[PDB]
Every structure is written in C-alpha cells, then in structure tokens.
C-alpha cells in the first residue's frame, strides 16, 4: 500500500498527458522538394526545414 | 582494539537490506524478469 | 521429533532482527509480482467482450 | 411546482459495483453525436485523444479526426491550421458565440453536454427516458410553437424538437437503428465523457478490498495481543488491617 | 535549572550605581568622546585597510587592461594589413 | 538517565510529551477522535497542496482548470476526490469530538475548552471559502447569499460588505482573495492545535466515569499507539469506500454549471454539514435579529461551563441528564433535514418549533436537571 | 511566585524564555542582527501576502497582473516595492549575521551552527523561485539557465530535470508550481527558526572577548529590548530611503519585457546577492566538475567547526587569524564584481585566480594560522 500511493502522487507532478501530446508533432511528409522546401515549429522554436 | 564483532555481519546484511530496497523502491532495468515482469 | 515449520523458521529468520527485516523486503517483492497479476484476471474474467482487450481483436491490424 | 416525475431506475451494464462499460456500444454512441448533436449542443472539454477507450486505434482516430476540423489557418501567418494535425484539437463548436447560438435557437440556449450527466439530477436515466418521452398535450393546456410538451422536463415545455425517429442513421456496425436502440447507445456515451477514468478506477475498488481483507483482522490480532496483559489483571487487597 | 540562582559563585565583589535620574544622558559626549573614537580607530585601521586597497587597484587596472584590448581594434594590428 | 538518547538533543525531551504521557486505564473508543482529527488534517494539507499546483485563480480560467484536472492529469481524479470528501470525513469526526466533550463533562477543563471553541470556529470559515473556488453555479450564488447577509449591521454594514467584495459584486477580485485565504489559513489551525493540545498535558485526560484517575495510569507508547493506528486504519476505508465506489453521494451539490449571474437555480443550499445553521436563519422573519441567532448558535458552547449545575461530572450516572441529552441529538438531526426542504407551510411551522426547543434544552432544562438529582440523592 | 501572572496560563512561562533570559553585559551592535532578521522576515510575510491577493499565476495573465498592481490599485505601488527591496535588505542583514559567526568564533556551538546552515540554504531557494514569478524576460532565461544546469548528473539527470519542468521547457506548468512553492515555503523557515533559536537558550549567547561570561549577566527586558527597537528603527530608513526615493537602484535588473523564448538578452545575470556563486561556476571549464564547486561553495561552512585549530575562541586577539580574515572579505567582494562582467580574457584569468585563493584561505591558511600562534605564545 505504501509504494503505490507514493508513486501515485509523484506521478501527478511529472508530466501532463496533454503536453506529452504536443511533443514532437511535426511529422513532415510535405516540405517543397529540392533546396527551399518549407518549414515547421517543433518544441516552441521554428526556423527552416 | 579493534575487534569488529558480529556488527560486521550485522552491517553487512543491513547494507544488503537497502540495496535490494532501492531496486524494490524504484524500477529501472525492472531487472532480468525472474518470475513475472510485465512486457 | 522434528521442529514444527515455525520452530525452524523462528530460529533461522525472526531471531536475527536483520534477517527479520530483510525477509520482509523480499516478501513484498515477490508478493506484488504475483498478487497484482491475479487481481486482473479475476476482474477481467468478470467483464468479457466489454473490453478492447477482447474487443480490439475485431479491428486490430485491420 | 410542476410535478417532477422520476426516471425509473433501469438496469445498466455498468450499474453494478465491479461492472464496467461496454466499449462496443460506445462507438455507436459517439457516431450519433457526430451525426445529430453536432447541430447545436457542443462539447468543449474533450479532445480526439480517445484512442483505445472507445477502441479506435490511433490510425483510425487520425483519419477519423482529419476530416472534421478546423477553419482558416492563414491569418497573417498567425493562427491554427486546417486539418488538425495530431489529435490535439477539441471538438469544433457549431457556434462562434453564445448569441449566435441563442439566435438560431429562438431564444433558447443549448447547454453544454460534456458533464451534463453529472449536472442534472437523476443520473443518466433522466436523459434516456426524457428523449424517450414525448406525449400528447393534455386537454386544456397550451404551448408556444417551439415549445413541446414533455413530462420530465421541469417546465414541460421544451424548445428541442425531438431528434429521434426509428432509424435516423446507419451504424458502422450495421445493427438495426431503433429509437430505443439508438437512444441508449448515446446515454452510455455521455456517461463515459463525464468520468473518463471510470473503467479504470474500479480496479483499485476491487484491488484495495482484496488488500484490505488482510489487515483489519491482522491489526486487530495485534491489538488484543498487546492489551492481553491488561485484560488478564487480577487484584487482591491484603491489608495488614 | 532556573537561570539566575545557580549561575556561578563570586565572592567579595562590590557594586555601586546611581538612579538614571540623578545623572545625565551625555557626560561630556563630544569632549570626552571624540578623542576616544580616534585612538580606537587607528588600532584596527592597520589591520583593515590594506586588503581593500589591493582590490581597488585591481579594479582600476582591470578596466584599463580591459579597455585597451577591445575598444582599440587597430592597436596591436593596425589597419595596414 | 545514563546515555538515554532522549536527552541529548533537547527536542526529544519535548517528544516525551507523547511517549510517557500517562493516561487513564479505561478509555472508550470514543477517545480515538483525538488523533483522527489530526490525521484528517494532515491528509488534507498534502492532498490540499498537489491540487494547488495545477489550479489557477481567474474568473476566466478557474473552472476550465478544474475540468483540466479530472481529465488530463495522471492520477488527477483521485486527488480532487480525496480532498473534497476529505472535508466531510473531517467534520463527521469533528462533531463527535465535541459530543464526547459534553456527555462526559470534559468541558470542566476551563481553558482547553475555550481554545476548543475558536479552533472549531476557524475551520467553519476555511471549509467555507474553498467551497467557492470551483466557481461553479452553486458556488457563485452560495457566495452572494452568505456574504450579502452580513449587511444587516445598522450603519457600517453597507460599507463593510462592499469592502470584502472589493467592488459591487462577486466578480474577479472577490475570487482571488478567497484563494489566497483558503490557502494560508489551515496553517494557522495547525498553529493553534499545538497550543490547544498544550494545556491538556498539565491535567491529563478525563476518563469515562468522571473520577480522578490518579491511582491508575499507563504508558502511552505500547498501548494507545496501536489503538490509534487501528483507529487510523478504519478511517481509510470509510474514506476510500466513499471516495472510490460512490463519488458523488455525499457530494450532494449537483451543480457543475459555469456560474451565470443572470440565471438562478431553483433550490440553493450549502453543503450538508452547514445546513442546520442555515436552517436556524429562515426561522426568524426579522432580518437583523435573524443574523444574531446564527452567530449566537455556536457561541453558546462557550457559556456551557457556567452551567455545570451538579456535584458529579459525568452524565453516565445521571439518567435524566442523560435522557434529555439524546433529545438534543434528534433535535439537531431534525434541523438538518428541515433546512434541506422548501419553505412551505408544513415545514415552516416545524422549524420555528424546533428552534425554540433547541435553546430550551441547553439553556433551561439541562441546568435544571442537575438541580433535582442533587436533591434526590440527598446531597 | 505568589500571584505572579507569569505562571497562570502556562504559555507565559514559555514566554520567560525571552524576558529573563540572561545575557552578557558587553555586547556590540553586531549582535543586533539577531532580531533584524526576524523583523525583516515578518515584514515580508504580510507584505508578501497582500501581493498575493491581486496576483494571478498564468502564462497569459501573470505579467499583465503585475502591471495591474502598480497602476490601478490604491497604494499598490508601495507594496510591490516594499516586498522586492525587502528581499535585498534581508540578505544584507543575513550575511552580517554569518560574519559575526566566524570572527568571534560563535560556531563553537556545534548544533546551533548546523541548523544555521540549513536555515540559510532554504532562503536562497525561496528568494530564487519568487524571482521567476513576474515572468519577465530576465526571469524566463534566468530560469532556464539555473535549472537546465542541473542536467549534469550522469544518468538520472536527463529525466530529473524534465520532471521539475513538467514538460520539455519552461511553459505554463513550470510557472504554476513556482507560485505554490514560493507561497508556502517561508512558513517552514518560520518553523525551523523557532527550533534554531531553541538550542541557543541552553548555553546562552557568546560574547565578544570569547570568554565564559558566567559572573556577569543582565536581565533581557529593560536593556536589550530598547537596543533592538533602536536597531529595529534604523532599518526602516535604510529600507524606506531606498524604496522611496530610488526604487530601481538596487533593482539592478532592467528587464520588464514580456518573455519571448525566441529572443535572447545580450547579458544575463541573477540579481546581485547571487552573483558570486554564479561567478564560481564560469571558472571551471568542465561542466560536471563545475556544478560540484557551486554546491560545495556553501556546504564548506558546515565543515568549519572541525578546523578550530587554536586554544582561544575569539579572533579579536589573534592578529594573524584576523589579518587573513579580511582578505577573504575582499576576495568575496571581488567575486561579486567579477561575475558581473563579460567573459573576455582580462576577466577570465582573474576569476580563475580568485577562485583558488578563496578555498586556500578557508581550507588551508586559516587552520594553519592558529597553529603558529599557539606555538608563539608558548601554549
Ligand atoms: C434541433 C437542434 C437540436 C438537436 C439536433 C439536438 N438538440 Fe437537444 N436540445 C436543443 C436545444 C436548443 C435544447 C434546450 C432547449 C430548452 O432547454 O428549452 C435541447 C435540449 C437538450 C437537452 C436538455 C437541456 C436542458 O435544458 O436540460 C439535452 C440533454 C439535449 N438536448 C441533448 C441532445 C441530444 C442527446 C441530442 C441528439 C439526440 C440532441 N440534443 C440534439 C437542440 C437540439
Ligand atoms: C483544513 C484544511 C482544508 C480544508 C477543510 C479544505 C477544504 C476544502 C474544500 C471544502 C474545498 C472545496 C472542495 C471542492 O471544491 O471539491 C477545497 C478546495 C481546495 N483546497 Fe482546500 N482544504 C483544506 C486545506 C487545503 C490546503 C492546505 C490547500 C493548499 C495547499 C488547499 C487547497 C485547495 C484548493 C486549491 C482547492 C481548490 C481545488 C478544488 O476545490 O477542486 N486546501 N478545500
Ligand atoms: C481541529 C480541531 C481539533 C483538534 C486537532 C483537536 C485535537 C485534540 C486532541 C488531539 C486532543 C487530545 C485527545 C483527546 O483528548 O481526545 C484533544 C482534546 C480535547 N479537545 Fe480537541 N481537537 C479539536 C477540536 C476541538 C474542539 C472544536 C473542541 C471543543 C469545542 C475540543 C475540545 C477538546 C477537549 C475538551 C479535549 C479534552 C477532552 C478530554 O481530555 O477528555 N477540541 N483535542
Ligand atoms: C522569506 C520570505 C520571502 C522572500 C525572501 C520573498 C522574496 C520574494 C521575491 C524576491 C520576489 C520577487 C520580487 C519581485 O518580483 O519584485 C517575491 C515575489 C512574490 N512574493 Fe515573496 N518573498 C517572501 C515571502 C512571501 C510570502 C510570505 C508571500 C505570500 C504570502 C510571497 C508572495 C509573493 C508573491 C505573490 C510574489 C510575486 C509578486 C511580485 O513578485 O511582484 N512572498 N517574493
Ligand atoms: C532566517 C535566518 C536566521 C534567523 C531568523 C536567525 C535568528 C537568530 C537569532 C534571533 C539569534 C539569537 C540572536 C543572536 O544570537 O544573534 C541567532 C543566533 C545565531 N544564529 Fe541565527 N539566524 C538566522 C540565520 C542564521 C544562519 C544562516 C546561521 C549560520 C549559518 C546562524 C547562526 C547563528 C548563530 C551561530 C547564532 C548564535 C551566535 C551567538 O549567540 O553569539 N543563524 N540567530
Ligand atoms: S549553458 Fe549555454 S552558455 Fe553556459
């Protein structure tokens, strides 16, 4: 009975299930071919790909 | 003196008490399955 | 006469308070590994065809 | 002081202690929502994250999602996007705004359906028999045009036109679509939306009992062990007197 | 135990004092004081000042050595080549 | 005390206020509610904490966020349910902890009683404010009623209310306050508690017969420490069994709807443990006089020690003094269900009747009951 | 003790831990920082509170709300400025309160010292987290640096960080936490404080000469109570004069801009009292080894009592042992300004030099200094 509940509380702080869904969402499969392509925005930042 | 008496076999176990404890305390390598261990 | 299972047990384990502590740890160790596995089947055997675990077989890998 | 009837308690596949929900029926139950409730009543609080709860496998859900979604996506490079991407979205609302909602409803306000199970009194049975019951107005009673007489509803005049007739739809399964069969299949769905943890929690509900059977006697074993010295007392008064 | 009773043993030590009214709040504050400040300012100052002095030099020196390096680019390498 | 480890840090000699604290021999289970308050208090603060980390105080946000807990947070649903139901299992203890107070005449301890009174009076405030935080429908109007009620004061009333609200009504800044209060305030209760327990260590506990127990005492460590643990265990089920199978049973408020100031719910009540107080109020037609009773409802507990009318402490030996006492129990129990009913002439009259009876028992009958029995036994 | 009102509630005999606590006669003003910590602590919690009532924790809201305080709330500008500057006037006390510790050799009290160490170590945590709350630019990046630094741990590092963040980065849920911590945590400091003061009552204070003062003691009520008040008064100006005329002077961070994760400010530093610690870090090129020093920076304070190397407690009588000590002062003072400078080569070398010297003074020279002088005086 000890280990579960302790492991249950600590399982509250660690990670949301919503944010985890927002981790690495860029799947690609589009771009623009050759040397210009297009772009995206992964974990907050966004540049060129 | 120093005669280290059964305190040594005492401590020796106690050291092995917590060592298993952490493994039990935590999980990690879950440990070579050795009687059920989920996938 | 041979000592009853306890009479042995007490001399081997519960005497030294170290072992008396240690045995407890390994005890709960194996305990949760077997115990939890049984509890599912009992529950799962109650609900059949009400869970994807069974239901998912209709559509899984097409 | 309208007489409020009570929904008679029906059996429920989840009614029992350790009873669970039927996922199979839920798939239908969701299908209805996308069909009918899409008109007015929305659900803000749920994502497409459903995956294995309603059994939709992640692949199926993705395609299931990527039809539905959202508008626009070009507002000077700031905004959202078409075709949701991952499941992250919530469910698209039919209305931009409470006013545009109310306007088409002829002054009526469709409530949110997310937790509406736990909101109204009477539990889910309220809904089912409500959608069930539509009667003929008794002799000597009048109503407004939109308002329809239904006994369960508190004022017994409702602006909801009855949605259901026999076989409004076809099911992904193909089970015949019945006003009774259709209705219940929904009234299971909502019950899942109001507590998605449902089927998960009762595990402990069982699993804590099997745990707890041990302790109470065991602890009660020790208590009498310690005290056993007190309850064994004997006194005697031996004065030199 | 209790604090004041048992503290320590002292013998034949006599004490005198006056009411705070009889006497003054400033028994030659400026006159008797201002020398007293000095004689006790110098006893430490030998032991205190020197280390801080070292700091201030480093600070000044540090900035200058810093300045020359950055501010003047055509210093070591002038713009010829 | 040779190499006894209990001296060496001093702080442990302060920790022999527990272990060797001598106690009576015979103690009914009714004295276990000493501990079970504490543990119901601790179990809050933690479970009270890990809610805070995901909660947000805003008129726009707050309700959305509570949605966000039950849905998206791993193990997020248990905690919210432990916290809320951990309140009700707190009072049901608390009342009993008063009940033992009267019926054995423990109030004879004169100071410890009083600090008892305040310590109650605070909780009722805390367990209120938090109940606003979800910002649901029953929280909004249930907020206006209680506060706006306070306007009854003859002159400063009109200002004093508007002060707390920080405006004309219950919009934002009225919320943010009631978060920052409901957060801090339990710590103060924990502060007083370690005072409320203090004076007790001087005179020791009372014991069921109402007799000076001096000749018979027992170490506190081997014996009662188990019994509290055993006591501590039965709580969990009574907490778990409720919070796990049947979440909303005692969760009697049915209203999760986001508060709309325009609409009004047909029936409005506090949660259960308050009702009887709120029932007292409806009785008095006169507004101002009405409020006083509600304030005077609890405070009378402080005046009880003046009314000790007899020569023996317990009520276990006084049949009369016992006879009445139980009628008072149903009398309260009556009030509970009364307030939980609409205001319609079969009910209306009843509450007015039960109201007077309530005081009449405490304030007249019981102090008289002791007088006769002194006369009976020839005292 | 006939009708002495100090017994009757017991709690007041606990309150003769102050009034008759005997003290030395001669006490320098340097012992006033006993109190002035406490009052700087209380004055927080209040002024720390009335900020909470209008603050809101959200990524969207928070910064807007702090705007909302300085603008729209009656007397809203003083409080925010008392709170923030009430932090700096807290440390400037605190350090002195350690300084007196060494130079008179008060650390000889072995337990009270340690609890001293922790009690420091906590504050540095609190006065950190709050500094995130405004959610300004210097708060955002100054958050990432400190935390992400902790990834140095060989294996569990990568997880342990992501745990606190509750995600991949410093977005919302990382904020909400650091409110709920920075709120509660001071109360714990107040908890320890009443322990940290306890052990002291057993042995009494030390006194400047480093001599057992037994023969000469004084009541605490008529005398030192004034002197602390006088001490308590000079703070206010030093607090007011700063907070009133020159708000932003010690408010050295210039950055109110709403945090943009994309941009980066050219220079990034903690506020002042941290710098020297952060300066230690830049020295070590090796990352992991670098972190340890920073952790090992303070902890050495715990090991000092092992190094008492001489036969007399004070440093007022040891010229050498006094000579070095002051060099350590400038040495710290050096570090401060060093970290506050860019990492060009004139500075770079310097910090590396001052780093070694710092430890060399504490860990080698000072313990040696006492040895010689024992030998000198013929001890
Ligand atoms: C014709 C548009 C429309 C359709 C389609 C529709 N609803 Fe209704 N429904 C309404 C409106 C508008 C109300 C509230 C009107 C009122 O309360 O007077 C309502 C009432 C309700 C209520 C009760 C609201 C209350 O006040 O308690 C529920 C529950 C509900 N609908 C659910 C459903 C379900 C389930 C379906 C699918 C069978 C559905 N709605 C389809 C328009 C619709
Ligand atoms: C005696 C102690 C406490 C009591 C009686 C108490 C009672 C309550 C109650 C009755 C509620 C409303 C229940 C609900 O809305 O479901 C509540 C909510 C809350 N409490 Fe407490 N609480 C206590 C301690 C704490 C503590 C110590 C904290 C913070 C550390 C805390 C934080 C909260 C929060 C954030 C909420 C809103 C969450 C929510 O209501 O869903 N509470 N509390
Ligand atoms: C959070 C609130 C409270 C806590 C934590 C608390 C805790 C305790 C504890 C631990 C004891 C010692 C065990 C015992 O004597 O039963 C005690 C004793 C007592 N408390 Fe409280 N109690 C609380 C509320 C109250 C209240 C509200 C009252 C009265 C209004 C009260 C009156 C008493 C009395 C009279 C005793 C001593 C009775 C006896 O020794 O026989 N307590 N309390
Ligand atoms: C030792 C005690 C405390 C210290 C050292 C401390 C320190 C700080 C610091 C350094 C800040 C950031 C200053 C600023 O942003 O201008 C801050 C902000 C804040 N503190 Fe504290 N604080 C303490 C106690 C408290 C308490 C007891 C509370 C709540 C009752 C509190 C609530 C806040 C809040 C809400 C903020 C954000 C307001 C703001 O930063 O403008 N603090 N505190
Ligand atoms: C919030 C933090 C602190 C508070 C409230 C505090 C408060 C006090 C007070 C009121 C005293 C009695 C007056 C005095 O002896 O000067 C004291 C004594 C002392 N404190 Fe602390 N102090 C704090 C931090 C520290 C720290 C960080 C240390 C060491 C690392 C420390 C070490 C000592 C020592 C050694 C004494 C006794 C010195 C002597 O009696 O001569 N204190 N403290
Ligand atoms: S960690 Fe990126 S600069 Fe030091």
Q: Which of D190, D155, D154 is nearest to D30 (CA)?
A: D190
Please, how many CA atoms are within 13 Å of residue D193, restricted to the half-sphere of its CB? 26
Compute the distance between CA of residue D30 and CA of residue D191 in angstroms, rounded to an integer. Answer: 12
Give the residue ranges of DSSP H helices in chain F.
33-52, 62-72, 76-103, 110-129, 137-148, 157-165, 173-196, 200-203, 224-245, 275-283, 287-303, 319-339, 345-360, 366-377
Q: How many CB atoms lie within 10 A of CB F231?
A: 18
Experimental method reported for this structure: cryo-EM
No. of H helices and E strands in chain A? Answer: 2, 0
| Resolution, angstroms, 1 dp | 4.6
C51: CATH: 1.20.5.260
Do chains E and D have 3 or more beta-carbon pairs under 8 angstroms? no
User: Do F235 and F39 contact (CB within 8 A), yes or no?
Assistant: yes
User: Do G176 and G60 contact (CB within 8 A), yes or no?
Assistant: no
Compute the distance between CA of residue G220 and CA of residue G236 in angstroms, rounded to an integer. Answer: 23
Cis peptide before B2 (omega within 30 of 0): yes
Q: Which of G238, G211, G247 is nearest to G78 (CA)?
A: G247
For E19-46, b/e burial (b = at least 16 CB within 10 A) is eeeeeeeeeeeeeeeeeeeeeeeeeeee
User: Do D71 and D80 contact (CB within 8 A), yes or no?
Assistant: yes
Q: Can you tell me whether residue F181 is helix, strand or coil?
A: helix
Q: How many CB atoms lie within 10 A of CB A49?
A: 12
Compute the distance between CA of residue D12 and CA of residue D106 in angstroms, rounded to an integer. Answer: 36
Q: Are residues D1 and D19 in the same domain?
A: yes
Query: Phi and psi dihedrals of D128, rounded to 5?
Result: -55, -55
Q: Are residues D142 and D217 in the same domain?
A: no
How many residues comprise chain B?
A: 39
Q: Can you tell me whether residue G67 is helix, strand or coil?
A: helix
Compute the distance between CA of residue G55 and CA of residue F57 in angstroms, rounded to an integer. Answer: 9
What is the separation, in whole angstroms, between the first and last Cα of chain E? 87
Query: Phi and psi dihedrals of G68, rounded to 5?
Result: -60, -30
Compute the distance between CA of residue G98 and CA of residue G106 in angstroms, rounded to an integer. Answer: 9
Q: Can you tell me whether residue D47 is helix, strand or coil?
A: strand
Compute the distance between CA of residue G172 and CA of residue G166 in angstroms, rounded to an integer. Answer: 9
Q: How far is the CA of D219 from the centre of ligand 3 (A)?
A: 26
What is the separation, in whole angstroms, between the first and last Cα of chain D? 82
Going by C-beta distance under 8 Å and a sequence separation of 6 or more, which residues neighbour residue F242? Answer: F85, F89, F249, F250
Compute the distance between CA of residue E79 and CA of residue D180 in angstroms, rounded to an integer. Answer: 93
Compute the distance between CA of residue D143 and CA of residue D158 in angstroms, rounded to an integer. Answer: 9
Q: Express the helix, strand and coil content of chain G in percent, nearest 5 each.
A: 70, 0, 30
Q: Does domain B1-39 have CATH number 3.50.50.60?
A: no
- Residues with CB under 6 Å of ligand 2 are F 41, 44-45, 48-49, 51-52, 55, 66, 80, 83-84, 87, 90, 126-127, 130-131, 133-134, 182-183, 186
Q: Is G68 a catalytic residue?
A: no
Q: Which of G361, G372, G365 is nearest to G311 (CA)?
A: G372
Q: Can you tell me whether residue F318 is helix, strand or coil?
A: coil
Give the residue ranges of DSSP H helices in chain D.
23-35, 58-68, 98-104, 116-119, 125-132, 179-194, 198-227
Compute the distance between CA of residue D146 and CA of residue D165 in angstroms, rounded to an integer. Answer: 18
Compute the distance between CA of residue G175 and CA of residue G132 in angstroms, rounded to an integer. Answer: 8
As for how many domains chain D has, the answer is 2
Query: Any idea where the domains of chain E sit in the sequence?
Result: 2-75
The helix (H) or strand (E) run that includes residue D149 is strand D148-149
Query: Any idea where the domains of chain B sit in the sequence?
Result: 1-39
Which class is E2-75 in CATH?
mainly alpha
Going by C-beta distance under 8 Å and a sequence separation of 6 or more, which residues neighbour residue F82? Answer: F43, F47, F239, F243
Nearest CA to ligand 5 atom 17: G34
Q: What single DSSP character describes residue G164? A: H
Compute the distance between CA of residue F345 and CA of residue D98 in angstroms, rounded to an integer. Answer: 40
For D46-72, b/e burial (b = at least 16 CB within 10 A) is bbbbbbbbbbbeeeebbeebeeebeee
Q: Which of F177, F149, F152 is nearest to F164 (CA)?
A: F177
Going by C-beta distance under 8 Å and a sequence separation of 6 or more, which residues neighbour residue A46? Answer: A39, A40
Compute the distance between CA of residue F277 and CA of residue D168 in angstroms, rounded to an integer. Answer: 53
Provide the shortest C-alpha distance from residue D174 to chain F (in Å).
Answer: 32
Nearest ligand for residue G42 CA: 4
Compute the distance between CA of residue F85 and CA of residue F320 in angstroms, rounded to an integer. Answer: 38
User: Do D151 and D5 contact (CB within 8 A), yes or no?
Assistant: yes
Q: What CATH architecture does domain G2-379 belong to?
A: Up-down Bundle (1.20)
D239: CATH: 1.20.5.100
CA gyration radius, chain F: 23
Q: Can you tell me whether residue G362 is helix, strand or coil?
A: helix
Do chains D and B have 3 or more beta-carbon pairs under 8 angstroms? no
Task: Burial-class residue B36 by CB neighbours within 10 Å (0-12, 13-18, 19+).
Answer: exposed
Q: What single DSSP character describes residue D157? A: E
Query: Any idea where the domains of chain G sit in the sequence?
Result: 2-379
CA gyration radius, chain D: 27
Give the residue ranges of DSSP H helices in D36-178.
58-68, 98-104, 116-119, 125-132
User: Do G369 and G318 contact (CB within 8 A), yes or no?
Assistant: yes
Going by C-beta distance under 8 Å and a sequence separation of 6 or more, which residues neighbour residue F183? Answer: F52, G183
Chains that touch F (3 or more CB pairs under 8 A): A, D, G
For G24-58, b/e burial (b = at least 16 CB within 10 A) is beebeeebbbbbbbbebbebbeebbebbbebbbbb
Q: How far is CA G94 from the centre of its chain?
A: 5
User: What separation in angstroms does the CA of C40 have from each of C30, C37, C45, D210?
Assistant: 17, 6, 8, 12
Strands (E), chain B: none
Task: Burial-class residue F179 by CB neighbours within 10 Å (0-12, 13-18, 19+).
Answer: buried
Q: Can you tell me whether residue F53 is helix, strand or coil?
A: coil
Q: Are residues D228 and D239 in the same domain?
A: yes
Q: Domain residues for C29?
A: 2-60
Task: Burial-class residue C53 by CB neighbours within 10 Å (0-12, 13-18, 19+).
Answer: middle
The helix (H) or strand (E) run that includes residue G275 is helix G275-283
Which residue among the candidates G65, G151, G205, G297 is catalytic per the annotation?
Answer: G205
Tell me whether strands D148-149 and D157-158 are parallel, antiparallel or unpaired.
Answer: antiparallel
Task: Burial-class residue F4 by CB neighbours within 10 Å (0-12, 13-18, 19+).
Answer: exposed
Q: How far is the CA of G334 from the centre of ligand 6 (A)?
A: 23
Task: Burial-class residue F256 by CB neighbours within 10 Å (0-12, 13-18, 19+).
Answer: buried
């Amino acid at each position: 009975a000890a280990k579960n509940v302790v492991s249950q509380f600590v399982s509250s702080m660690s990670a949301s299930a919503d944010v985890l869904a927002m981790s690495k969402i860029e799947i690609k499969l589009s771009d623009i071919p050759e040397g210009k392509n297009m772009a995206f925005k992964w974990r907050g930042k966004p540049l060129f790909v | 003196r120093q005669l280290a008496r059964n305190w040594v076999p005492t401590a020796s176990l106690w050291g092995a008490v917590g060592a298993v404890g952490l493994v039990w305390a935590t999980d990690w390598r879950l440990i070579l399955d050795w009687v059920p261990y989920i996938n | 006469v041979a000592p009853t299972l306890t009479a042995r047990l007490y001399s081997l384990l519960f005497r030294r308070t170290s072992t008396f502590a240690l045995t407890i740890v390994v005890g709960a160790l194996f305990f949760e590994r077997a115990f939890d596995q049984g509890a599912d089947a009992i529950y799962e055997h109650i609900n059949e065809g009400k869970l994807w675990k069974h239901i998912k077989h209709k559509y899984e890998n097409k | 002081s309208d007489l409020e009837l009570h929904p008679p308690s029906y059996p429920w596949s989840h009614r029992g202690l350790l009873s669970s929900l039927d996922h199979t029926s839920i798939r239908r139950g969701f299908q209805v929502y996308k069909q009918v409730c899409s008109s007015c009543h929305s659900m803000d609080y749920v994502a497409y994250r459903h995956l294995v709860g309603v059994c939709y496998t992640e692949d199926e859900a993705k395609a299931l999602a990527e039809e539905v979604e959202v508008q626009d996506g070009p507002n000077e490079d700031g905004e959202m996007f078409m075709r949701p991407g991952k499941l992250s979205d919530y469910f698209p609302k039919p209305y931009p705004n409470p006013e545009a909602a109310r306007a088409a409803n002829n002054g009526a306000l469709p409530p949110d359906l997310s937790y509406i199970v736990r909101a109204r009194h009477g539990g889910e049975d309220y809904v089912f028999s409500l959608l069930t019951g539509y009667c003929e107005p008794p002799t000597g009673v009048s109503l407004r045009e939109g308002l329809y007489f239904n006994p369960y509803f508190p004022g017994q005049a409702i602006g909801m036109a009855p949605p259901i007739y026999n076989e409004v739809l076809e099911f992904d399964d193909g089970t015949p679509a019945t006003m009774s069969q259709v209705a219940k299949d929904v009234c299971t769905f909502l019950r899942w939306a109001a507590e998605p943890e449902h089927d998960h929690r009762k595990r402990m509900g069982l699993k804590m009992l099997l745990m707890m059977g041990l302790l109470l006697p065991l602890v009660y074993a020790m208590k009498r062990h310690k005290w056993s010295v007190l309850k064994s007392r004997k006194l005697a008064y031996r004065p030199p007197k | 135990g209790r604090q004041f009773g048992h503290l320590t043993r002292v013998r034949h030590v006599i004490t005198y004092s006056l009411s705070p009214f009889e006497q003054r709040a400033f028994p030659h504050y400026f006159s008797k004081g201002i020398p007293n400040v000095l004689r006790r300012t110098r006893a430490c100052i030998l032991r205190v000042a020197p280390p801080f002095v070292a700091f201030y030099l480093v600070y000044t020196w540090g900035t200058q050595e810093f300045e020359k390096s950055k501010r003047k680019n055509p210093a070591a390498y002038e713009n010829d080549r | 005390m040779t190499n006894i480890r209990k001296s060496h840090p001093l702080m442990k000699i302060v920790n022999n206020a527990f272990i060797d604290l001598p106690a009576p021999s015979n103690i009914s289970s009714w004295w276990n509610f000493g501990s079970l308050l504490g543990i119901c208090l601790i179990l809050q603060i933690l479970t009270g904490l890990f809610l805070a980390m995901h909660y947000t105080s805003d008129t726009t946000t707050a309700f959305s966020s509570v949605t966000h807990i039950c849905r998206d947070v791993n193990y997020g649903w248990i905690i919210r349910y432990m916290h809320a139901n951990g309140a009700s299992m707190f009072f049901i203890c608390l009342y009993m902890h008063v009940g033992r107070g009267l019926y054995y005449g423990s109030y004879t301890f004169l100071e410890t009683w009083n600090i008892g009174v305040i310590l109650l009076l605070t909780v009722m405030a805390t367990a209120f404010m938090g109940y606003v935080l979800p910002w649901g429908q029953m929280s909004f109007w249930g907020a206006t009623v209680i506060t706006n009620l306070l306007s009854a004061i003859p002159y400063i009333g009109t200002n004093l209310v508007e002060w707390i609200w920080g405006g004309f009504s219950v919009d934002k800044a009225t919320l943010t306050r009631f978060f920052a209060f409901h957060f801090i305030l339990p710590f103060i209760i924990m502060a007083i508690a370690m005072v409320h327990l203090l004076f007790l260590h001087e005179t020791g506990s009372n014991n069921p017969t109402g007799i000076s127990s001096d000749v018979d005492k027992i170490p506190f460590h081997p014996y009662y420490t188990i019994k509290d643990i055993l006591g501590a265990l039965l709580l969990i089920l009574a907490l778990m069994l409720l919070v796990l199978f049947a979440p909303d049973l005692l969760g009697d408020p049915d209203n999760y709807t986001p508060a709309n100031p325009l609409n009004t719910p047909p029936h409005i009540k506090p949660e259960w443990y308050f009702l009887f107080a709120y029932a007292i109020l409806r009785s008095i037609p006169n507004k101002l006089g009405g409020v006083l009773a509600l304030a005077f409802s609890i405070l009378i507990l402080a005046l009880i020690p003046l009314l000790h009318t007899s020569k023996q402490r317990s009520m276990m030996f006084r049949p009369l003094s016992q006879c009445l006492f139980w009628a008072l129990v149903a009398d309260l129990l009556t009030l509970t269900w009364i307030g939980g009913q609409p205001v319609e002439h079969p009910y209306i009259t009843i509450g007015q009747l039960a109201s007077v009876l309530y005081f009449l028992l405490i304030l007249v009958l019981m102090p008289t009951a002791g007088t006769i029995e002194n006369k009976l036994l020839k005292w």
